[PDB]
Amino acid sequence: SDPVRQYLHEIGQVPLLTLEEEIDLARKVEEGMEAIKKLSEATGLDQELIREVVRAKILGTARIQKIPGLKEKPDPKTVEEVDGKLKSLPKELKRYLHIAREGEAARQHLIEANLRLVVSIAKKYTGRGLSFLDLIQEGNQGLIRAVEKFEYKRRFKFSTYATWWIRQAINRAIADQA
DNA sequence: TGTACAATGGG
Ligand SMILES: [K+]
Ligand SMILES: [K+]
Ligand SMILES: [K+]
Ligand SMILES: [K+]
C-alpha cells in the first residue's frame, strides 16, 4: 500500500447497508431519475446534465469525496446556469426538484456503501497487467453502472448484481490491454 | 436495450 492506504481507510469506515436500507435508497434513486425525467421534460435540458448538476450540489454531504474511476466536475457555470433555470422554475414543480435531490443523494450513499465490495473483488485480479488502483477505478466504474441499472423489485440482494458488473468491468478492462 | 442466489478479511 501507499497513498491508497488512505482510500481503503476512507471506505472501511462506511458501514454496510441492511436490506431495508438498500431498498429504500434504491427506491429513492429510481424515483430521482423519474423526477429528473419530468424535469428534463419541462426545462428541455439533458437528463444526464440535470442529474450531474444535482449531484455536484449534494456531493457536499458525501462521506467520500475523491472516489477513483468516478467522473468529477462538471463546470460551475453550467452548474450555475442550469441550477438557475431549475430553482427559478414554477412552484407546482418544486416537489420534483426535491425528489431528484433525494435520489442523487441516495445514489451517492449507496455507492459509498459498496466500495468495500469493489476492493474485495478487485484483489482477485491483481497480477494481470493492471496496477491495483486501475482495478479499483474500473471496479468503481462497473459499480456505478450497476446502481444505474439495478431493479430492486427483483428481490435480489444488491451485492449479487453489483458483483456481476464489477467483474464485467475489470474483465473488459484487462481485455482492452491487448 | 439485456446482462441478477450472495458476495463488502477469505473459504
Ligand atoms: K479470524
Ligand atoms: K485472527
Ligand atoms: K473467521
Ligand atoms: K468464519
Q: Is the CB of A137 under 7 A from strand B?
A: no
Q: What are phi and psi of A150, to 5 degrees?
A: -55, 125
> C-alpha grid cell for residue A154?
427483483
What is the extent of the structural domain holding A178?
1-178
Q: What angle do CA A155, A31, A61 make, to 5 degrees?
A: 105
User: A41, exposed or middle or buried, with CB in 10 Å at 0-12, 13-18, 19+?
Assistant: exposed
- Ligand 1 centroid distance, CA of A125 (Å): 23
Per the structure, the count of domains in chain A is: 1
One-letter amino acid at A77 equals: K
Separation of CA A41 from chain center: 23
Alpha-carbon span A126 to A32, nearest angstrom: 36
Number of H helices, E strands in chain A: 8, 0
One-letter amino acid at A95 equals: R
> What is the DSSP-derived secondary structure letter of residue A14?
S
Q: Cβ atoms within 10 A of the Cβ of A2, count?
A: 8
Q: Rounded to the nearest 10 degrees, how much is the dihedral formed by the CA atoms of A22, A28, A29, A30?
A: 100
Q: What angle do CA A145, A140, A130 make, to 5 degrees?
A: 120
Nearest to A147 by CA among A122, A173, A113, A102: A113
Q: Is the CB of A164 under 7 A from strand B?
A: yes
Q: Is the CB of A158 under 7 A from strand B?
A: yes
Q: Is the CB of A9 under 7 A from strand B?
A: no
- Helix (H) / strand (E) element for A40: namely helix A19-43
Q: Which residue is nearest to nucleotide B9 (CA to C1')?
A: A120
Alpha-carbon span A168 to A171, nearest angstrom: 5
Q: Which residue has the cell 458525501?
A: A62
Q: What angle do CA A28, A168, A166 make, to 5 degrees?
A: 50
Resolution (Å units): 3.3
CATH number at residue A169: 1.20.120.1810
Nearest to A154 by CA among A28, A22, A35: A22
Name where chain A breaks: residue before each gap, C-N > 2.5 Å.
Answer: none
Q: How far is the CA of A106 from the C1' of B4 (A)?
A: 21
Question: End-to-end CA distance of chain A, in Å?
Answer: 27
Q: Which residue has the cell 441516495?
A: A106
One-letter amino acid at A71 equals: K
Separation of CA A147 from chain center: 7
Whether A115 and A11 have beta carbons less than 8 Å apart is answered as yes
Alpha-carbon span A161 to A147, nearest angstrom: 9
